[PDB]
Amino acid sequence: VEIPSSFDSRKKWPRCKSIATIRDQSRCGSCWAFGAVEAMSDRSCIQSGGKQNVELSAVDLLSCCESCGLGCEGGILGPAWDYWVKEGIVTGSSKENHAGCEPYPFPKCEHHTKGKYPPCGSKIYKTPRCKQTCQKKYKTPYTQDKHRGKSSYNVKNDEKAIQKEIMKYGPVEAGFTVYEDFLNYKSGIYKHITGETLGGHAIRIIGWGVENKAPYWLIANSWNEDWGENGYFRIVRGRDECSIESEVTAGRIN
Numbered sequence: 001v002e003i004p005s006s007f008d009s010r011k012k013w014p015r016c017k018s019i020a021t022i023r024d025q026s027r028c029g030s031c032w033a034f035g036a037v038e039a040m041s042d043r044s045c046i047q048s049g050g051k052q053n054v055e056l057s058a059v060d061l062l063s064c065c066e067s068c069g070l071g072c073e074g075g076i077l078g079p080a081w082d083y084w085v086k087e088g089i090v091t092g093s094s095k096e097n098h099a100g101c102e103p104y105p106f107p108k109c110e111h112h113t114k115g116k117y118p119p120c121g122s123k124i125y126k127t128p129r130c131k132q133t134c135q136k137k138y139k140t141p142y143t144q145d146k147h148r149g150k151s152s153y154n155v156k157n158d159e160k161a162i163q164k165e166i167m168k169y170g171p172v173e174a175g176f177t178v179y180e181d182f183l184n185y186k187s188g189i190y191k192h193i194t195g196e197t198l199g200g201h202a203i204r205i206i207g208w209g210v211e212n213k214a215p216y217w218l219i220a221n222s223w224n225e226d227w228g229e230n231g232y233f234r235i236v237r238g239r240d241e242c243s244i245e246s247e248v249t250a251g252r253i254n
């Protein structure tokens with residue numbers, strides 16, 4: 001397949017409401033779980049021809065996956081996608097939207113950037129308990145609100161491979177190395193220039209493009225709409241910038 005100079009999953013599959021959604025981890029290192037449930041939400045819709053049109057619960061995956069790492073202290077992508085395939089994940093919106101089986105317990109906050117929400121600050125919440133209980137207004141039992149994948153896999157660390165994957169099957173989750181200068185991002189095409197490592201971050205790649213000959217990946221961060229470019233950032237594409245092409249993981253419902 002020929003790869004177009006630009007692609008945006010929001011524009012290809014606009015009936016799928018989750019794709020254009022920007023979420024917020026709040027004061028919790030749950031990026032690993034957000035990147036997953038976001039991409040799973042997008043993909044469940046894309047791959048089902050719009051039959052599933054849900055927001056999958058971040059807290060269910062964060063709190064219930066025992067093999068996924070340390071919860072709010074950080075996680076592991078392979079087991080997150082495996083949990084979706086084997087156990088599945090229920091529905092659940094942000095705290096503020098109070099929708100679905102298990103909405104997120106934690107409120108929006110500003111992540112090292114200016115805005116209308118309270119600053120997140122440096123402290124992290126304890127990983128929520130695995131409650132296995134839909135909110136009282138949601139009239140489906142927890143186990144019966146589960147959405148399951150069929151397969152999961154890591155994507156080849158090749159630019160064209162990642163592009164074909166996104167274009168054909170939907171947004172992917174991707175891990176990358178976060179350096180201090182990432183905290184200072186307001187807009188533009190990011191590359192690492194200053195600052196030391198802050199570990200890793202997991203996000204959702206929704207597309208790609210090119211501006212003034214500079215190619216980039218287009219990515220949804222999970223730090224609310226006030227961070228970066230209305231919740232998104234762009235990063236250099238084609239040079240494994242901060243290992244952005246080397247930790248891609250996704251999966252399929254069928």
Ligand SMILES: *[C@H](CS(=O)(=O)c1ccccc1)[C@H](CCc1ccccc1)NC(=O)[C@H](CC(C)C)NC(=O)N1CCOCC1
Nearest residue numbers: 029030031032069070072073074075175178198200201202
């Ligand atoms: C999310 C990244 S983040 O918090 O949104 C972020 C932090 C700083 C800069 C930019 C983004 C989590 C943070 C986990 C954390 C780390 C240190 C203190 C508290 C919480 N990152 C992860 O979950 C990563 C995911 C990988 C795919 C990169 N994993 C991770 O941090 N760990 C793996 C499990 O062992 C613990 C560490």
